[PDB]
Paper text:
RgNanH comprises a GH33 catalytic domain and a sialic acid-binding carbohydrate-binding module (CBM40). RgCBM40 displays the canonical CBM40 β-sandwich fold and broad specificity towards sialoglycans with millimolar binding affinity towards α2,3- or α2,6-sialyllactose.
Protein ligand complexes were achieved for both 3′SL and 6′SL. Definitive electron density for the Neu5Ac and galactose residues was observed in the 3′SL and 6′SL complexes. Due to the glycan orientation introduced by the α2-6-sialic acid linkage the 6′SL glucose residue is close to the protein surface. Therefore, α2-6-linked LacNAc N-acetyl group may be blocked by protein residues, whereas the α2-3 linked glycan would be more solvent exposed. In the 3′SL complex, the lactose positioning would permit further extensions to the carbohydrate chain as would be present in more complex or anchored glycans, whereas these may be blocked in the 6′SL complex. This would provide a degree of specificity towards sialic acid linkage. The affinity of the interaction between RgCBM40 and sialic acid ligands was further assessed by ITC. Furthermore, it would suggest that the additional binding interactions observed in the crystal structure of the complex between RgCBM40 and 6′SL do not significantly promote binding, also in agreement with the STD NMR results, showing that sialic acid is the main binding epitope in solution. In the RgCBM40 complex crystal structures, sialic acid is bound in the α-anomeric conformation, allowing the axial C2 carboxylic acid moiety to form a conserved interaction with Arg204.
Author numbering:
A (entry chain A): 44 to 237
B (entry chain B): 48 to 236
């Protein structure tokens, strides 16, 4: 990891439900909007009982393009997932893992760390939470962010759908990093388990 | 040997075909792992068409089922569900089967295996492995709460036939055994 660098990073970002936090103008956003593969690592605390809370999304926010996006999300039941979409006629690749994260511990909102990697070489997606590899998906027709049509935004804490903040998170994004590099499972186990 | 097999079952769009009373249905309703192989011809433009389902058809339990389905866009998928709070494990693969081709309906063969030891699901269509899913928390049909039916051509949801297929289920076989990838490439060809 000594010479690995993120293409986009943010730290210490509070977000109330429905507000989101726009990253579209950040240096590095263009790179994120074109990823063919890579790694996303996010530490957060959720204060929200919303059922589906996007931590990070990248997609097409325009009218009629509401099924064209990627997001990495958590749920109110302690689930972690992702969706990678370009309308269902093109692709809808998803993961949803139960009982992988926690909202609270000893009456306090607890930090969790999750990660997703997408590896073009072996057509594989892997999801991690809190020190564990929780799911692996292989697709013959591999896709990633550069396959979504008309990407125009990157954001924390929701997914833009026809100009509305969908899948709204509340709480704190403690640390968020996006890499073009595909990090090893050992690295992701270590960073998510810390 | 299969635990349940049927051949030449033609289904009017929306009706389904109940297998719940067949010999072997109990075993299918309790599978911890296994393999499903289905050759079919669809004659329907319905968006989502279950080929085979196993689930809980009772009121309030509409998210408790397994099905292997095709779509009108040439997709193949499966969902394994016991309400989203418990599990929702899915696959959806584009451009894997044909709904029609040279203005004609056409046969396809698909397969799904669920492998408990490897904690793995693999989906096949027409001689190709199209997706693999590995879940740390492996589930299958015996983890669904209140299974009470097995059907071709739809999924029972609160007493309604959801995801309705129309056409012919040419051959369907369900195994408790986990077939090899090579065997599934061959049988789906
Ligand atoms: C993470 C997750 O569950 N995301 C799904 C999302 C959420 O469950 C809800 O938004 C939470 O309220 O639901 C999505 O589906 C709902 C929409 O479906 C649209 O129809 C789909 C149809 O179901 C597909 O079979 C078809 O291929 O595409 C249609 C068009 O998108 C309805 O038109 C729309 O009104 C909603 O009901 C969603 O996109 O919001 C699916 C997410 O995977
Ligand atoms: C193969 C497939 O696409 N299956 C999905 C199915 C189909 O897209 C549609 O049925 C085709 O018309 O849609 C399902 O979701 C629709 C229902 O969602 C319900 O709310 C969900 C909510 O979206 C989840 O986030 C939550 O965890 O669970 C809720 C309760 O199920 C609505 O209550 C209901 O009215 C439908 O809109 C479906 O179950 O039918 C999801 C399938 O994966």
């Amino acid at each position: 990891m000594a010479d690995i660098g993120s293409v986009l990073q943010k730290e210490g970002i509070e977000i109330s439900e429905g507000t989101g936090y726009d990253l579209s103008k950040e240096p590095g956003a263009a790179t994120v909007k074109a990823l063919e593969q890579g790694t996303i690592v996010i530490s957060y605390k959720t204060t929200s009982e919303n059922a589906i809370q996007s931590l990070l999304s990248v997609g097409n926010g325009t009218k009629g393009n509401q099924d064209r996006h990627f997001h990495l999300y958590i749920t109110n039941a302690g689930g972690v997932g992702m969706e990678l979409r370009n309308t269902d006629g093109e692709f809808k690749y998803t993961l949803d893992c139960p009982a992988a994260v926690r909202g609270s511990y000893k009456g306090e909102r607890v930090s969790n760390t999750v990660a997703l990697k997408a590896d073009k070489e072996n057509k594989q997606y892997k999801l991690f939470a809190n020190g564990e590899l929780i799911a692996t998906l292989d697709q013959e027709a591999f896709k990633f962010i550069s396959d979504i049509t008309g990407v125009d935004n990157v954001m924390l804490g929701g997914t833009m759908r026809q100009g509305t903040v969908a899948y709204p998170f509340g709480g704190s994004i403690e640390r968020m990093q996006v890499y073009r590099d595909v990090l090893s499972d050992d690295e992701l186990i270590a960073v998510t388990g810390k």
